[PDB]
Design an enzyme around this catalytic site. Structure first.
Site, PDB file in Angstrom:
ATOM      1  N   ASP B 153       0.805  -1.221   0.000  1.00 40.90           N
ATOM      2  CA  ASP B 153       0.000   0.000   0.000  1.00 40.90           C
ATOM      3  C   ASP B 153       0.832   1.264   0.000  1.00 40.90           C
ATOM      4  O   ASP B 153       0.537   2.229   0.721  1.00 40.90           O
ATOM      5  CB  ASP B 153      -0.959  -0.025   1.189  1.00 40.90           C
ATOM      6  CG  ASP B 153      -2.188   0.858   0.976  1.00 40.90           C
ATOM      7  OD1 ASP B 153      -2.490   1.260  -0.183  1.00 40.90           O
ATOM      8  OD2 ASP B 153      -2.873   1.214   1.941  1.00 40.90           O
ATOM      9  N   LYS B 155       1.722   4.728  -0.852  1.00 46.68           N
ATOM     10  CA  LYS B 155       1.101   5.964  -1.361  1.00 46.68           C
ATOM     11  C   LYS B 155       1.452   7.132  -0.435  1.00 46.68           C
ATOM     12  O   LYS B 155       1.762   6.908   0.727  1.00 46.68           O
ATOM     13  CB  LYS B 155      -0.428   5.829  -1.475  1.00 46.68           C
ATOM     14  CG  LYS B 155      -1.131   5.398  -0.217  1.00 46.68           C
ATOM     15  CD  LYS B 155      -2.623   5.237  -0.432  1.00 46.68           C
ATOM     16  CE  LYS B 155      -3.309   4.720   0.816  1.00 46.68           C
ATOM     17  NZ  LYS B 155      -4.717   4.260   0.578  1.00 46.68           N
ATOM     18  N   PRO B 156       1.401   8.364  -0.931  1.00 50.33           N
ATOM     19  CA  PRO B 156       1.710   9.546  -0.105  1.00 50.33           C
ATOM     20  C   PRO B 156       0.859   9.686   1.168  1.00 50.33           C
ATOM     21  O   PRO B 156       1.319  10.262   2.172  1.00 50.33           O
ATOM     22  CB  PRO B 156       1.407  10.729  -1.047  1.00 50.33           C
ATOM     23  CG  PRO B 156       1.446  10.195  -2.383  1.00 50.33           C
ATOM     24  CD  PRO B 156       1.079   8.735  -2.317  1.00 50.33           C
ATOM     25  N   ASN B 158       0.146   7.369   3.142  1.00 47.48           N
ATOM     26  CA  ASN B 158       0.744   6.493   4.172  1.00 47.48           C
ATOM     27  C   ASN B 158       2.173   6.860   4.553  1.00 47.48           C
ATOM     28  O   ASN B 158       2.880   6.063   5.197  1.00 47.48           O
ATOM     29  CB  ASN B 158       0.714   5.030   3.681  1.00 47.48           C
ATOM     30  CG  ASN B 158      -0.683   4.431   3.713  1.00 47.48           C
ATOM     31  OD1 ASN B 158      -1.569   4.961   4.378  1.00 47.48           O
ATOM     32  ND2 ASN B 158      -0.878   3.299   3.024  1.00 47.48           N
ATOM     33  N   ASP B 171       0.819   2.225   8.270  1.00 40.19           N
ATOM     34  CA  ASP B 171      -0.231   1.353   7.739  1.00 40.19           C
ATOM     35  C   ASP B 171       0.300   0.090   7.082  1.00 40.19           C
ATOM     36  O   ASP B 171       0.601   0.052   5.854  1.00 40.19           O
ATOM     37  CB  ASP B 171      -1.201   2.079   6.827  1.00 40.19           C
ATOM     38  CG  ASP B 171      -2.608   1.460   6.892  1.00 40.19           C
ATOM     39  OD1 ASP B 171      -2.679   0.227   6.888  1.00 40.19           O
ATOM     40  OD2 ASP B 171      -3.679   2.102   6.969  1.00 40.19           O
ATOM     41  N   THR B 188      -4.305   0.360  -3.402  1.00 38.16           N
ATOM     42  CA  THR B 188      -5.038   1.583  -3.739  1.00 38.16           C
ATOM     43  C   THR B 188      -4.974   1.708  -5.281  1.00 38.16           C
ATOM     44  O   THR B 188      -3.900   1.515  -5.872  1.00 38.16           O
ATOM     45  CB  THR B 188      -4.373   2.768  -3.017  1.00 38.16           C
ATOM     46  OG1 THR B 188      -4.495   2.571  -1.600  1.00 38.16           O
ATOM     47  CG2 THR B 188      -5.114   4.090  -3.287  1.00 38.16           C
TER      48      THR B 188
HETATM   49  O1  LIG Z   1      -3.920   8.131  10.467  1.00 40.07           O
HETATM   50  S1  LIG Z   1      -2.774   8.929  10.340  1.00 40.07           S
HETATM   51  O2  LIG Z   1      -2.931  10.282  10.716  1.00 40.07           O
HETATM   52  N1  LIG Z   1      -2.239   9.012   8.793  1.00 40.07           N
HETATM   53  C1  LIG Z   1      -2.258   7.872   7.897  1.00 40.07           C
HETATM   54  C2  LIG Z   1      -3.679   7.475   7.460  1.00 40.07           C
HETATM   55  C3  LIG Z   1      -3.698   6.278   6.505  1.00 40.07           C
HETATM   56  C4  LIG Z   1      -4.727   6.680   5.273  1.00 40.07           C
HETATM   57  O3  LIG Z   1      -6.083   6.707   5.718  1.00 40.07           O
HETATM   58  C5  LIG Z   1      -6.615   5.369   5.776  1.00 40.07           C
HETATM   59  C6  LIG Z   1      -6.790   4.904   7.186  1.00 40.07           C
HETATM   60  C7  LIG Z   1      -6.867   5.770   8.294  1.00 40.07           C
HETATM   61  C8  LIG Z   1      -7.085   5.259   9.568  1.00 40.07           C
HETATM   62  C9  LIG Z   1      -7.209   3.872   9.758  1.00 40.07           C
HETATM   63 CL1  LIG Z   1      -7.514   3.217  11.286  1.00 40.07          CL
HETATM   64  C10 LIG Z   1      -7.124   3.002   8.672  1.00 40.07           C
HETATM   65  C11 LIG Z   1      -6.919   3.521   7.396  1.00 40.07           C
HETATM   66  C12 LIG Z   1      -4.279   8.240   5.169  1.00 40.07           C
HETATM   67  N2  LIG Z   1      -4.358   8.652   6.793  1.00 40.07           N
HETATM   68  C13 LIG Z   1      -1.600   8.127  11.211  1.00 40.07           C
HETATM   69  C14 LIG Z   1      -1.636   6.733  11.236  1.00 40.07           C
HETATM   70  C15 LIG Z   1      -0.712   5.953  11.956  1.00 40.07           C
HETATM   71  C16 LIG Z   1       0.305   6.564  12.667  1.00 40.07           C
HETATM   72  C17 LIG Z   1       0.380   7.977  12.687  1.00 40.07           C
HETATM   73  C18 LIG Z   1       1.432   8.622  13.415  1.00 40.07           C
HETATM   74  N3  LIG Z   1       1.594   9.933  13.464  1.00 40.07           N
HETATM   75  C19 LIG Z   1       0.691  10.708  12.777  1.00 40.07           C
HETATM   76  C20 LIG Z   1      -0.361  10.204  12.018  1.00 40.07           C
HETATM   77  C21 LIG Z   1      -0.559   8.784  11.953  1.00 40.07           C
END
Ligand SMILES: O=S(=O)(NC[C@@H]1C[C@@H](OCc2ccc(Cl)cc2)CN1)c1cccc2cnccc12
EC number: 2.7.11.11
Lengths: 20, 337
Positions: B153, B155-156, B158, B171, B188
């Site tokens: 997965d 992508k920007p 993540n 992720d 994606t």
């Molecule tokens: O959730 S975040 O803010 N950013 C990554 C996510 C992924 C993708 O969305 C799909 C997604 C989001 C939440 C979940 Cl449970 C499932 C799918 C883009 N936003 C994030 C996740 C994990 C660790 C982090 C640490 N520091 C800041 C932000 C973080």
């Protein structure tokens, strides 16, 4: 322009995962 | 030596893989602050750990939604792999646990925001800027692939930017430890290799195709294959005609033709020379691979930092109460979590 086409598209926001 | 560094990394990983950490915190040890991201069967919140005052990102998955969406095995993969890995450009898992309703993975908080956000706002990255990020991915995939892991997965959205301007990959929901071939349709749309779309068995080469898509997107400001609907995206991918912006360098276009290569006998990353085909390509000639790994390269961009627990680099999401049922849900399914 390709940029213009992208910005006018519905896929400039966060793109969701797909699965089967 | 790379081979020697990777052999010891594998030793470390294997011990954790075979004996996973389980139940290392509890929900009441954290104060929930704000939602940082949302997905189909959960969300990620900024939290503060009361005993240390550290801030973390807590991923909260609803067990019933995981089950409904048939992502049980994928979620067990995510936690089992994440607790076992250790690399500078991977978000670190600090704790995990579960309760009656939810699964929890508490990770390092990366305050600089998603690459996605900065890329969309700024429009595109310069080739040196993109190259800086790309090198980190190449080394991360070298590491993961050496452990028989496919990520699946890239992508920007993540990729998070830390206070030093380096990448942290988050992720691991589609990450899988697999020797040989696998078949699940996941990823994606914009980043899917043609093999996945055509329902072939595929391997770690799909990550290298995805790197091509990421580099293109970083340098162009839009991905190489886009449309309003996924089916139209898949058609473009399987045709495989890529057009590059006139501003792309010769070296960039040559790297991308070798990454965005439908032919698996020709795709860089997948040949007899492996990742070294990528590391030694002309586009990367100015990259000091050792210095990137050591975080000694000055980052092109350093995020605005207003303080501990600041979320200004993140978008706002609707908040919803975390409910914990008085009955255990899906106990057998998530037994090993
Ligand atoms: O959730 S975040 O803010 N950013 C990554 C996510 C992924 C993708 O969305 C799909 C997604 C989001 C939440 C979940 Cl449970 C499932 C799918 C883009 N936003 C994030 C996740 C994990 C660790 C982090 C640490 N520091 C800041 C932000 C973080």
């Amino acid at each position: 322009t390709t940029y213009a086409d992208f910005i006018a598209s519905g896929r400039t926001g966060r793109r969701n995962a797909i699965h089967d | 030596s790379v081979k020697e560094f990777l052999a010891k990394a594998k030793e470390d990983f294997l011990k954790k893989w075979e004996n996973p950490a389980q139940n290392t915190a509890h929900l009441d040890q954290f104060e929930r602050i704000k939602t940082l991201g949302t997905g189909s069967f959960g969300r990620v919140m900024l939290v503060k750990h009361m005993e240390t005052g550290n801030h973390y990102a807590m991923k909260i998955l609803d067990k019933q939604k995981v089950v409904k969406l048939k992502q049980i095995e994928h979620t067990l993969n995510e936690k089992r792999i994440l607790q076992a890995v250790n690399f500078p450009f991977l978000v670190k898992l600090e704790f995990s646990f579960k309760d009656n309703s939810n699964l929890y993975m508490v990770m390092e908080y990366v305050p600089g925001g998603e690459m996605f956000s900065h890329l969309r706002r700024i429009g595109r990255f310069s080739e040196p800027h993109a190259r800086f990020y790309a090198a980190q991915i190449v080394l991360t995939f070298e590491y993961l692939h050496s452990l028989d892991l496919i990520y699946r997965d890239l992508k920007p959205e993540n990729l998070l930017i830390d206070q030093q301007g380096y990448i942290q990959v988050t992720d691991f929901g589609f990450a899988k430890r697999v020797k040989g071939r696998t078949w699940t349709l996941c990823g994606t749309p914009e980043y899917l290799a043609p093999e996945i779309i055509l329902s072939k068995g595929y391997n770690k080469a799909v990550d290298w195709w995805a790197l091509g898509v990421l580099i293109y997107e970083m340098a162009a400001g839009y991905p190489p294959f886009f449309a309003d609907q996924p089916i139209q995206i898949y058609e473009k991918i399987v045709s495989g005609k890529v057009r590059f912006p006139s501003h792309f360098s010769s070296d960039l276009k040559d790297l991308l033709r070798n990454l965005l290569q439908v032919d698996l006998t020709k795709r860089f990353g997948n040949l007899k020379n492996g990742v070294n085909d990528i590391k030694n390509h002309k586009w990367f000639a100015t990259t000091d691979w050792i210095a990137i790994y050591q975080r000694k390269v000055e980052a092109p961009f350093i995020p605005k930092f207003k303080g501990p627990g600041d979320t200004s680099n993140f978008d706002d999401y609707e908040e919803e109460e975390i409910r914990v049922s008085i009955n255990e849900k899906c106990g057998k399914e998530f037994s090993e979590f």
